[PDB]
Design a binder for this molecule. Structure first.
Ligand code: CA
Ligand code: CA
Ligand code: CA
Ligand code: CL
Length: 294
């Protein structure tokens, strides 16, 4: 469907750093949040389906996309709590109002689910896919990349990611079923062209996944939003994937218990936006049209 980005990038200063985002159209927001190691670019072929339905927003997480890096960077930087501080502040600055639709993926779902729990009166609907829906165990983690993610969460991680850019160059293509073009990979590589700390966000992220009880802070946050989502009557759209990756097994079983939820299944592994963007876009647009009748 295409390598061209959607909209043009806008910038805003947050906590002394410049963050980048797309913000197109008018009305109540439809807020698309990427995870690791992507950016707003992930949604480029999905956002068009929602033209005229709202204010279409996609933010680049701090240190990712065209958002500033956090210097001095190191192993303590780009934890979930730091990302949340920046993203909360950006979302506050964007004046989103009180009828937001969240569309979330991967770490964007942890961030968005947590924000939704804290700002529940403002959330009109939640569309999610390949999400971090609850704390998990290693047996729940997809078998293909289990050993690699264990290596990320070990001293080996710095060489794998900071030196060799494995998250961008191996994990990302490995979890997309169709071949990416030169331009698409260039867009994903761009924030991470430089070896070393420029790539830290793509290593800190796997180190934050709530697996086998650690990190305990993120485990607790995910336990909280898991409990809340399993009871909340807010309308939900679960975009399931086949074969899928993260939202399979026990996590998928849990997600299928959530109230007031519609489900569709699309082809894909993890980065399903690159495999089934039109199916995904059409489903989101239909969900929004139902949430926002004339
Ligand atoms: Ca209103
Ligand atoms: Ca192993
Ligand atoms: Ca090397
Ligand atoms: Cl990750």
């Amino acid at each position: 469907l295409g390598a061209k980005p959607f909209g043009e990038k806008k910038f805003i200063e947050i906590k002394g750093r410049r963050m980048a985002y797309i913000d197109e159209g008018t009305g109540d927001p439809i807020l698309f949040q990427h995870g690791n190691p992507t950016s707003s670019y992930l949604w480029r072929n999905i956002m068009p389906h929602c033209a005229g339905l709202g204010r279409l927003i996609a933010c680049d997480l701090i240190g990712m996309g065209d958002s500033d890096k956090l210097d001095p960077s190191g192993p303590e930087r780009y934890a979930y709590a730091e990302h949340r501080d920046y993203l909360d502040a950006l979302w506050e600055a964007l004046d989103l109002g009180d009828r937001v639709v969240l569309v979330v993926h991967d770490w964007g779902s942890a961030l968005g689910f947590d924000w939704a729990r804290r700002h529940r009166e403002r959330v009109q609907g939640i569309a999610y896919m390949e999400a971090i829906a609850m704390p998990i165990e290693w047996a729940d983690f997809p078998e293909q990349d289990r050993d690699l993610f264990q290596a990320f969460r070990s001293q080996a991680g710095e060489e794998l990611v900071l030196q060799d850019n494995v998250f961008v160059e191996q994990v990302l293509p490995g979890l997309i079923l169709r071949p990416l073009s030169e331009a698409e990979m260039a867009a994903y590589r761009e924030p991470f062209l430089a070896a070393g700390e420029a790539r830290r966000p793509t290593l800190s992220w796997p180190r934050q996944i709530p697996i086998a009880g650690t990190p305990a802070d993120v485990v607790a946050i995910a336990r909280d939003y898991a409990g809340w989502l399993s009871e909340s009557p807010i309308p939900k759209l679960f975009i399931n994937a086949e074969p899928g990756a993260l939202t399979t097994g026990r996590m998928r079983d849990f997600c299928r218990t959530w109230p007031n939820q519609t489900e569709i299944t699309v082809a894909g592994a993890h980065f399903i936006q690159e495999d089934s963007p039109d199916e995904i876009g059409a489903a989101i647009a239909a969900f929004v049209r139902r949430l926002r009748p004339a």
